[PDB]
Structure formats: C-alpha cells, structure tokens
Design a protein around this ligand. Structure first.
Ligand SMILES: CC[C@H]1OC(=O)[C@H](C)[C@@H](O[C@H]2C[C@@](C)(O)[C@@H](O)[C@H](C)O2)[C@H](C)[C@@H](O[C@@H]2O[C@H](C)C[C@H](N(C)C)[C@H]2O)[C@](C)(O)C[C@@H](C)C(=O)[C@H](C)[C@@H](O)[C@H]1C
Ligand code: HEM
Length: 393
C-alpha cells in the first residue's frame, strides 16, 4: 500500500500520475477512498448531500465539533458562513492592501542579503494580518505558530482513528481555551474585529454558544495563516525553478496575480481534503459504501491532463483562476479567505521584486526541509538576495 509522504514531491507526483492512469478511485488499507481525477474531485466536492464534510460520521464514538464551519453541511452551513462572509468581500479585503504592504515592506527592509523567507516574511505577514482580523495582539503571534506547528506535525496514520481525533482535540485545547477567553472579552467590549462580529451574531435565532464561537474562532485563525505562509514559500521556490518569470514579473508586475494562480495550481498548499459518504454511492463507476471516508487529491486533479494541457509545465498564461481555482476548494466550502490570500501573496511578491529584483533559493542550506504531512511546502526557505539596496560601491 503506502501513499508516498508529502516531503518527496517528485515521488508523490509520480505516484499520483500512475493512480490517475490505473486506479483513479482507490481504497487504502484503512478503508479510506482516494479520488485522483479532476472531474471526479469536482463531482465529489459539488455533491454535499452524498459527500459530507463532517468526519465524525466515520470516527467510532466521535460527536461533531460544534461551530466547525469546514465540517458542517447544508442547510446548517449557509447560516454559519453568513456570520463572517461580509468580512471577506473583495471591496472590504481591498482596504487591507496598504496595511499588508506596510507590514511586508518593513519586514523585508530588515532582512540581510541571506535570509529564511519563512521566518522573515512568509510566517509573520499572514499571522499579523489574521491576528489583526481577529483583534488579537502581536505578543501572541509566537503561540500561534507553535500551536499550528504542533497540529501540522501531529502523529497521524489512519485518519479515521478516534485516537487521532482525541489527539487533535488535545493539541488545540490551549488555542481554543485562549480564543474562548477572547470571545468572552468581545461580548463585554466589542470592536470592529471578526471575533466581535461572531460573538454578537444570530445563527438560527440564537447567538453561538461559548463552545461554538470558540471553535469557530479556532478554525478562522488556523485557516487564516498556515496555507498563506505555505503558498508564499511555494511561489518563490517555484519562481526559483522557472526563473525567467522573475524578469517577466519585474517588467510587467500585472503578471503577478496570474503567477499566484498558477503556483496555487502547481503546488496547492493543502493537497488533499476529506469527505464522508452519507449513503452507498459511486465515483466514475466505482462502488463506494455508506459511512466511509473519501480523500480528494486536489494536487492530483491540478496535474490531470484531462483538465490542464501539459499539466506539469509551470505556465502563468493558463486561463484558470477565480472560482475555478481548485486549490481553494470547490462549491459551497470554497475558501472564504481567497481574496485575502491572493492579495497578501500579490503584495508579497511585488515587494520582493521591488526590493530584491529576485531571490535565489539556497538549495543546499540545511534548513530547507519539506513538511512531511498535511501541507505541501517547506518549513524554511533559505534565500539569497539577487540584488538589494544594501549593496555598496
Ligand atoms: C476553516 C478552513 C480550514 O480548516 C481548518 O484549519 C480546520 C480547523 C482543521 O481541522 C482540524 C481540527 C478539527 C477538530 O476540526 C478536526 O476534526 C480536523 C480533522 O482537523 C483542518 C481541516 C486541518 O487539517 C486536518 O488536520 C488533521 C490533523 C489531519 C487531517 N487529514 C490529513 C486527515 C487534516 O485535513 C489543518 C491542519 O488545519 C489543515 C490546514 C493546514 C489547511 O491547509 C486547510 C486549507 C485549512 O486551513 C482549512 C480546511
Ligand atoms: C493560499 C492560502 C489559502 C489556501 C490554499 C486555502 C485553502 C482552502 C481550502 C482548500 C478550503 C476548503 C476546505 C474544504 O473544502 O474542506 C478553505 C476553506 C476556508 N478558508 Fe481558506 N485557504 C487559504 C487562505 C485563507 C485565509 C487567509 C483565510 C482567512 C481566515 C481562509 C479562510 C477559510 C475559511 C473560513 C474556510 C472554510 C470555508 C467554509 O467551509 O465555508 N483561508 N481554504
């Protein structure tokens, strides 16, 4: 059996290609059903009645975690998402550009000629913007990275194991307790921020209870930084592999959003996602029973030649983007933060090119280590300044 790990990208991609070819719907040794083709991934994600986002159905003795937007289906999903949806509109998000650019430019200006992109910018920018979105203070950013890292590196094998779900609860316990305390504070003294908005909202004619609002806040915080960090790293790493694009972008900065969409397609931060079948069903003629877990490979769908011509060629001129960006999901759970992620990464890339022209990855620096699981990225990305304002006579 054995799915290759995320850390060896080449091995993983090769394995996905063979599966698209020879076993596009595959049951693994844990009874988890993997879906590899673009068209079938779209089918699964669109059909929420059959493919629930709630994992707890197949986790022995588990009950739903209340307030977890990413685990709730229609008709309940609409009402929860409506609580926060206006916080994320393009017009509202666009107002954040000056703040994002200020943070990015200040962070980059203090970097030497050799630095870890992750510690300098990719982590601090997204954690700052999400903390600010939630009304949280800067002193707490380090806790956020520690808690995220613990979750991302949680010991995991079988994803239906109730011991995993329990372990996840334990790891998030401090973060959730912290946010519950902040929810309580906002009920007593509300602000413009997202936590205030969520604690004062009505869903089904009643406020979210304390547990629901703390869990909802925990999901918002985690969603708001981890993948943005991963993508910005993947952007520079991917440009480094296709560096003719550094000059094309310097010459025409209006190319950057297209570069971002294409890096998303090429290296999705979150390469797979899970659903659970609510009834006996079928994917591409393959019978799947009721009450099992299904794993959709966004990464495999994005490299599927039936969907993308020459799929392993990095090509910003491809027409794909907007709501068709599968790396943000598809259908009802399509990423709420998508405009915000696109803006943060656009600004980051503009400022990188503004200051440095290009960054070269130092591929032999031992801090360059890929994540082993869950996300598709590197924990650090040691880089070297192409040029910078620091260079003298
Ligand atoms: C709200 C939208 C985000 O959801 C989460 O962050 C939620 C809160 C996480 O949920 C946790 C908490 C929980 C109690 O709800 C639990 O039931 C599930 C299994 O794990 C994500 C689904 C979680 O993913 C899950 O982590 C588990 C430890 C393992 C699981 N599978 C690989 C089995 C993975 O999906 C990550 C690590 O936050 C993913 C991030 C990095 C994204 O990239 C995603 C793009 C991520 O940012 C979004 C999916
Ligand atoms: C490049 C960076 C990002 C990527 C790749 C990404 C990816 C995704 C994906 C694939 C989903 C759907 C999960 C599913 O269908 O099960 C999702 C959902 C979500 N994302 Fe993002 N995300 C990014 C940034 C953000 C940011 C900055 C925010 C702001 C908080 C955010 C908030 C959310 C929320 C609230 C959901 C759940 C939506 C719902 O279930 O209705 N995301 N994200």
């Amino acid at each position: 059996d054995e799915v290759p790990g995320m850390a060896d990208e080449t091995a993983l991609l090769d394995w996905l290609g063979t599966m698209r070819e020879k076993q596009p719907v595959w049951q693994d040794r844990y009874g988890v059903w993997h879906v590899f083709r673009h068209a079938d991934v779209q089918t699964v994600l669109r059909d929420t009645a059959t493919f629930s986002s709630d994992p707890t159905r197949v986790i022995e003795g588990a009950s739903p975690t209340p307030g977890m937007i990413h685990e709730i289906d229609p008709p309940e999903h609409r009402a929860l998402r409506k609580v926060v949806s206006s916080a994320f509109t393009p017009r509202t998000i666009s107002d954040l550009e000056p703040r994002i650019r200020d943070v990015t430019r200040s962070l980059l200006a203090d970097a030497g000629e050799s630095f870890d992109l992750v510690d300098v910018l990719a982590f601090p920018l997204p954690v700052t913007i999400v903390a600010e979105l939630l009304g949280l203070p800067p002193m707490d950013h380090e806790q956020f990275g520690d808690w995220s890292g613990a979750l991302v590196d949680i010991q995991m094998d079988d994803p239906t194991d109730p011991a995993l779900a329990e372990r996840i609860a334990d790891v998030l316990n401090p973060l959730t307790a912290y946010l519950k305390a902040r929810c309580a504070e906002r009920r007593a003294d509300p602000g413009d921020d997202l936590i205030s908005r969520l604690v004062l909202a009505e869903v089904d004619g009643r406020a979210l209870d304390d547990e629901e609002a703390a869990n909802f806040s925990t999901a918002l915080l985690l969603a708001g930084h981890i993948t943005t960090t991963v993508l910005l790293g993947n952007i520079v790493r991917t440009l480094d592999e296709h560096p003719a694009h550094w000059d094309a972008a310097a010459e025409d900065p209006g190319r950057i959003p297209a570069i971002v969409e294409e890096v998303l397609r090429y290296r999705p931060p979150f390469p797979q996602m899970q659903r659970t079948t609510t009834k006996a069903t079928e994917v591409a003629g393959v019978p799947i029973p009721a009450d099992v877990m299904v794993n959709t490979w966004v990464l495999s769908a994005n490299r599927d030649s039936d969907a993308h011509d020459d799929p392993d060629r990095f090509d910003p001129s491809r027409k794909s983007g907007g709501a068709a960006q599968l790396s943000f999901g598809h259908g009802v759970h399509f990423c709420l933060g998508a405009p915000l992620a696109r803006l943060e990464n656009r600004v980051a890339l503009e400022e990188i090119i503004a200051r440095f022209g290009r960054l070269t990855v130092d591929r032999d620096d031992e801090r360059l280590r890929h994540f082993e699981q869950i996300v598709l990225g590197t924990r650090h990305l040691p880089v070297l300044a192409g040029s910078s304002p620091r260079q003298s006579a």
